[model samples]
Target: LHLTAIDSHAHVFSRGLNLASQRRYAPNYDAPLGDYLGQLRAHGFSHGVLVQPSFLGTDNRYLLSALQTVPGQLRGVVMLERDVEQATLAEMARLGVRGVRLNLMGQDMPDLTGAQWRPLLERIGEQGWHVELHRQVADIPVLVRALQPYGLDIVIDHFGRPDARRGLGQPGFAELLTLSGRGKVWVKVSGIYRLQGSPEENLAFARQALCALEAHYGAERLMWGSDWPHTQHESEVSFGSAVEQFEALGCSAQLRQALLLDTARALFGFELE
Candidate 1:
């Protein structure tokens, strides 16, 4: 079937790229933009957003270069220092960057409300870009609350990375739902394999989480992603399997369209040429 969809979250990095000193894991194999775009085409996606991988830290040169290859067909979210220059941000915006990522998986949470972050947050908001967060469920509410004051859209990664064992009972998830009322929070219904469980259990929790996410944020604020390359879970998952998992969410045709295409297209600025 001919399809047009956007993969909202994925990363591209090579083995010899500079690695961050504090990263928890590193990939030995290269995940270049060409390979990732090939997967996107094979899986029926017309466009994608390349997120800056945590291991690559704030050196966004690689990600920035990738966006140039297929300017209209790709967008990016880069990691940046709190003190990044306004000129640099503007330059990136011209290069198809529509968001910034805070891959807070293993790091201590920064005081986003503090003076140190205000200027950077202001700059990001001025650009009309969203902030993509990847932290566990318990910390999601706190981070979202701190970010809410800036009025920038917030995109949560991997079902908020909730505890698989706790599922909907994950403490901060309910609060995350409540925060959705402000209407600036969005969630990616991706990365079920990253959750802790047997394949069946993870899929079960994903369905439940999708239900709750849909109920709170509506399909307009929800998007689907391949979490391509599956990173640490590489051996067990492939791009096709990731797309299959997204299909397994059992979203209706309209909801699927929103998650796979429309929602992301608007958020990431994948305008039709």
Candidate 2:
């Protein structure tokens, strides 16, 4: 049986969204929501999850509005300040926001041990919301440990941001396998172009991480994402090719379906409506 695919990760921002001052670089154009759906339909995805781009900061007006417009066809993860009120989160949940993102790539990991922040993190869990993490490779070990105490489901972004040049034996890759083995943790098998390696090295790195994700965590604990608009690499990559590379990861059709469809329905609360 065939399952209509779900693009578990992507972003849609408009020209007027007002890029954050700390944005690493600017996209000359918008990846508008309507255009994103067209790409999804063309690529066989029936649903998608829009993540708030780090460049957009914590202003979720656009992300929340997009979910409102599309309804069941989309779900989203937004950035939030720790002090954000529960009422705000509740309203966001009502609009199909399933998680909060922590783009900790360059910044210090939040002092998660602080008592003040505990309630916020706990609130996130209380709402069944996971924390979507984007951090560099070396930090995965301690980052996993830090978030473990909060008891929130952890979703690591971009294949744990592994060092593609280092291959499977890389420490970060090993630590990811170890953490996900315990369950309650997930890793996105996406974003090969974001790897700091040659094409062959990147492909090797992705295959190793994905095959190990399946072996250690089982299909249910793994999900595929397109990292769409291909941001920085738009000139070199296309939306259609994102699906192609995911299939190229060499998992069985059954496993691919789980990654692309079934797992997301459960994790992000997408329904068949």
Candidate 3:
């Protein structure tokens, strides 16, 4: 009850992937740990989980470094190669990374064959880590069929990247509820700006998704995030604006605390859990 918010999903990529990569998508925009702390304090939030962004590809160097600076308030979702070193992954787990993310929506490339999956799932299972996934609506049935058997927690990004036009009843959000119904998955209440249906026109769009998630997964499995600075959608939204928009969706202190704390805590493997 003492906590205000624990932003469940967010990304950290600064200085074009820490002054190393010259990729086109990597903006000179660098959101450092100091800036994140300021925003977290200003928003009355206490903690956050940094997800690996598409812009950084598989290199989570910047995000890992950021979490290292503030272990108490921050945790992370990283990208790792299939045959990773258990000792190295275990060390990361101790620091604050609770999961690995697969960004299938932004990038249509990668191999997740059974050969890859066998070891990948083993490492996560060993660390008690979750697997956060971002993909198109159509891909869920396939991915879910494959990943759920591993029995690791699966957190979906942005309501399964639903058709911004169809809104909540869209097959994607429906499938999200369906996925959670299966018992191993959860969904983030971030990305309202990317979702269609005027969040203003119909708080219904907002209400519908929250209601669906709460009804199926219960309040415990649904968490909120600023999607701060929302770099990808930067033309229109900001971090403060994103939190304000998410706040408008209407969740009580208890539900907010669950989303803000418990859900993320379970997924990220925080010490408190």
Candidate 4:
């Protein structure tokens, strides 16, 4: 198929890999690169950004190998320790890694402004990569504030991971919206299933969140992600369903083009085929 759209967030992992000891969840089944590419092809997505699953920790060997398989068609977002070597960062960047993911769910917030993180952050900025954050809404403002001084672009995952019960009224979510003026912040309209609510409720909340995000960040700063294999919510979601949900957001044709193709293409630096 001739593919053009881009899915900005997804994970590819398999059993028997070295898993992070401190992770809160693990997948029993495999989400290998081949299967993930099949899903993208079936859904008309030309490229995708493979985010390192938190369970895989900082071992990006498997992820790097996958990028080699498709080369420029795929990009990666890896997890790295503060002391990661410049050589390693350069190598990963050469292999299609354009971002670093901080999957901060269930973990204490790191002091990103600390002296220890400065060198790594500086290297990341020099590489022209973004830092993708996966924390709850309440922690977003603080983390964004800390990361702002570094001048690297920021991509907030999963609607800033709003609190389900509170919806858009969630405390820090408003602050996240206010961050639109910063010009370097991007948000993924993804992982509707991860929200703690029924499917219908989640859909409604996602719609409202999308409206607010558009009003604030504009379509240019927003993108779509399938959150493929759906992880723990696999039973309730699929590539097709996720695409449908994105469509259900009722975006105008211009907005859909930006979310499905333009925004992520510009952010991840995906080249035209």
Candidate 5:
């Protein structure tokens, strides 16, 4: 772990930032970018990707500001408005924004079929930014199938979120594997609590799930993320525990380096200085 690593998925928000009315839960405490960067550096990580949480809606100002705090030390996957301007996207790209988050869970699906969103997607494609998906496992195949033709890199958050109860037999698990066969799809090994609720269970399930993912997709296709702040699981899972579970997988250092460093830079286009 001496090598500088990248925490591929994390959020940095404060009580002052405007939260969407549609949010499921309200966070009382702040997980600011300053503090998050401290955690990353203390944990032997040199970089992180700031993901615009769904609750933040399409206001990426907070995340964009955070990116400015640590220029080369971070990248972002933001949420944006449908009719966004091309100049805005160009500015975001300059500030290290690399993708857009489509958190389609517990919400109405955005109409991608219409031409309204085409320009935005095309702009994202023009910048080589990815579309980061957080949705129900069952909907992943359909999402990918729809967005695949846009020619944007598609990143599946939280291991395609297979239910731990069903393990690999989960309907979307196979689809996730199949999607990995396509060069455009990238899967993140993150958000352990979303996959399994308990501490011990998280480790046990990751041991099986990550091994299966590695066997099918190889380390090159997979990336590791701390999913820091843990959002709802903040009290249940700590930063230290998350790293422990990551180590519990017993992946080779080479594989770990791939997920933590090489693969992250490749996908996010992070300039490792």
Candidate 6:
């Protein structure tokens, strides 16, 4: 049987900053739309969801331009201030932005205080945007109590970033399963390299972590992404190998169908010819 995949998360950005004040969070960024697409097709992916990389901050010109090239085949997860106007969001919705990502780990976590937060979440709630978080697990439940009332879908990036040394069943993994059981959250089975540590490291212990995720989230709430170019991973992770490694997950085919096809279509809706 031939396998098909839609990478639920990935990024395209260049190296630049808005001002000197933004220097605190700088990562070596060199992804372009063409290069991303080339690798996507090469890996048997017919569709992709473009996440706004951390380095570019809120200026998503690079990601937006990539979406323009493929139009229907691509969807975007963007970054924006809570002060953003509704009209601007409407425009982005028209252009195929399905989620607004919060790179909490990369930048300063926003203070959801009095005025700034109320107006922000209210407007975002009105627009029905997902609040994807990349924060440490310790801080996630804080969001559960706070943002849950707003009724938004939440995506926890990089497998809640389990501590390979501490092993699974830690606070982070426990919260991950709990959130998924509540059915308000989704998990990205991406960054396998991150979890397993370097390939040369002889496996860092993410398999046990993923097994727990599969038990909690199941295939329905689980999604996969290439985490391509494996920037921090070097030779440890590869796009083709990610597809192969996902097989060891020992999940049902029916569930795999949802993770690879159904859930992704429900989220991004790529326009295939």
Best candidate per lDDT, number?
4
lDDT of 2 by residue, 1-273 (tens): 133778888998886554543243565677889989999898888899999987778888889999989877888899988787788888999999999987888786676667766777887988889988888767876767777888778888888898888877677777767663357787888888788887668877788888887788778878888898988788877887777777677888898888888888788977663
At residue 28, what lDDT does model 5 achieve? 67
| Pairs clashing within candidate 4 | none
Cα lDDT of model 6 by residue, 1-273, tens digit: 122667788877654433433444535555667777888888677778888877667887767777877777788789987588889887887887888886787456666544667777776778887777777666666655576777777777777766565556567666666663467677777776665455423133545666677687766667877777666664556677777766665557786777677677666655442
> Least lDDT summed over 10 consecutive residues: which range in candidate 6?
15-24
Number of clashes in every candidate structure?
0, 0, 0, 0, 0, 1
User: How does model 1 fare in lDDT?
Assistant: 0.85
State every prediction's TM-score relative to the real structure: 0.94, 0.93, 0.88, 0.94, 0.91, 0.84
State the lDDT at 181 in candidate 2. Answer: 36
Estimate, for each residue in 78-184, the C-alpha lDDT of model 5 and write its tens digit: 99887787788889989988899878887877676568778788878887889998887778877888888887788888888777767777788877765634677
Candidate 1 per-residue C-alpha lDDT over 1-104 given as tens digits, one digit per residue, 9 for 90 to 100: 13388889998986655344323366677798889989988878988989988877788988999989777788879998978877888999999899999788
Which clashing pairs does model 2 show? none
lDDT (Cα) of model 2: 0.81
Off-target runs (Cα >4 Å) in candidate 2 are 1-3, 19-25
**Of 1 and 2, the candidate ranking higher by TM-score:** 1
Sum up the clashes in candidate 3: 0
Candidate 4 has an lDDT of: 0.86
Candidate 3's displacement at residue 18, Å, is 4.6
Winner on lDDT between 1 and 5 is: 1
* Candidate 4 total steric clashes: 0
Q: What are the lDDT scores of the predictions, listed in order? A: 0.85, 0.81, 0.73, 0.86, 0.80, 0.69
Per-residue accuracy of model 4 over 1-273 as CA lDDT, tens digit each: 244899999999766453442333676777889999999988889889999988778888789999998888889799998777788889999999999987889998789898978888888998888999998888988888888999989999999888766868789898877763478899899998887888888889899999998898889999999999888888889999999988888899999899999999999887674
What TM-score would you give candidate 1 relative to the actual structure?
0.94
RMSD of each: 2.4, 2.6, 2.7, 2.2, 2.7, 3.7
